[PDB]
Design a protein around this nucleic acid. Sequence first.
RNA 1: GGGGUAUCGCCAAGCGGUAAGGCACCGGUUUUUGAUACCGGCCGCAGGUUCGAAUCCUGCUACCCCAGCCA
Length: 538
Amino acid sequence: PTNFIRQIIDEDLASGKHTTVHTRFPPEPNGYLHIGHAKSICLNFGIAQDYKGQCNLRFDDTNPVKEDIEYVESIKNDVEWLGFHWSGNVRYSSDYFDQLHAYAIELINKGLAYVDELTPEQIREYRGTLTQPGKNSPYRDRSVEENLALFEKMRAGGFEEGKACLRAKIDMASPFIVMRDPVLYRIKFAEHHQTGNKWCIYPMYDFTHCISDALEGITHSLCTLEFQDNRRLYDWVLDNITIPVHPRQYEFSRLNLEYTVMSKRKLNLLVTDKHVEGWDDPRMPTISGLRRRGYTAASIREFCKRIGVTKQDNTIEMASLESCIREDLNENAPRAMAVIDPVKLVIENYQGEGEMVTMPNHPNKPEMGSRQVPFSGEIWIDRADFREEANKQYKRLVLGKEVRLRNAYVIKAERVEKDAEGNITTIFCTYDADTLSKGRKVKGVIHWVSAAHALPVEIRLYDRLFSVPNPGAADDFLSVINPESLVIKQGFAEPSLKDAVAGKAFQFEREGYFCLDSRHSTAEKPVFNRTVGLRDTW
RNA sequence: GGGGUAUCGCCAAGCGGUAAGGCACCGGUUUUUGAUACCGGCCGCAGGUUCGAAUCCUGCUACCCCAGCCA
Ligand SMILES: Nc1ncnc2c1ncn2[C@@H]1O[C@H](COP(=O)(O)OP(=O)(O)OP(=O)(O)O)[C@@H](O)[C@H]1O
């Protein structure tokens, strides 16, 4: 695993610039973590463990209004669930409010900061545009003493929101818009989830992030491409205050996934408007959502490893992600029998109430042991596996042909029965009671579940949440939601599944990987989520 | 205006000496899962320097980001 960032780290180590690597994952606690965050997590924690260094978990809680304790809680859960551990205690940018406040005072004393009274609208008007330079505020020249007195007033709550703010004194004609006197502090009479109501002024991201990294001893600050401009302000702040270290920022491209949105705002909308059961709905690209869906922490790490880390914009295909969960589950998920679209089949040549047949826990792995399953003259099978008239390509059950029942006998169709609508209600067939080994020639195998002690199971089949590749680029991404993202079915599963535990995925043979969903499961009717289907192609 | 980016459908090695790999797709073998496994198939443009260019240069073109008291 190598990328431009690890090459930068190797160089620093060799040149002697650094003797140890210290990174951090700094999520703002304003929503749940998604697969995009996981990319950043593998990168940052990944780098630390490979270089025997440290990686911090720092909640960048600089905007109380959009934040909640709920999110800091779930975020820690998901980072841990992914298998990563942070260095020392969980950190919070808010742990540094007193420090940041002191640094703002240092800038003011050096005349590199001033309190501006331009309204929130006028500041945008004075900023200029992408092509036109901005102009200096009429307050820009206040004296140190006055800026000092005015900033203390901001802090003491003497100014209503937006009636004043602290700005850095840089260059209003800079081609970098972020350098046109960026706001350093803004007033918000809002309760903070960590500091309560001690503060009514809060530091902005650009002021907060570089100082927090610095204070924490960060060596390589890793973020996404949209902050490349910000790096100039990141360096300006550290170059102009009294601080011993100067971490360097390196930006890589964000992960984008086809058929889904990765914007926290848009995921929040889906949850707020109830278009998904919640942040962890199985169709969400959130970590908790992939977890419920049946994804393993190891398959997510594998994915992050495969997509690489560069500076090129990208949108990875779902197939790539699904490939990672299949490979994992294919190797470790024990097999089981279930029928999603059940049709009653009756073996007339079968006498008795039933018997017990042996079924391996993994056809390619005997070390996973075997189990006992009931077989009777009345077993459920899937509609799709039976057809009166079928070509040569079809290998399943045909009106007058015979197939091999999984881990059982070789039956043979003989007749059917249609109801009023004309839909088959029951398939009659006979079987060879001497089948359990390879004369003749059979071609085709199908799964089944005896109606004897069948377990009435609800199966949830999920699909892409959105019907277009780049829903985020649509005028209204909500209007492009896939109405079939979730299709609920009522099937039957072998009785052993009665002991399935949420968080353990089985491979329902010839149908895909599934796992119990504790949210909808009950003692009566269990609910299984289909993680992903098997590769299907004749 | 400034910051970035361009290598086979989607990702991505490469850092001037015959262009890795993964995903996808498509063939073939094995298979009592149409699965798995194992084979096989598959340098943005124009010039320039150079014995030699994906790599260095110049000039294009396309795309992404920046005009929050968000991050
Ligand atoms: N899609 C992504 N792919 C890789 N890293 C991401 C992605 N989205 C956010 N990150 C990074 O994860 C860390 C925490 O991000 P943060 O908590 O601020 O979410 P965010 O900025 O709101 O991103 P989003 O807009 O996707 O919600 C930052 O380094 C951020 O750049």
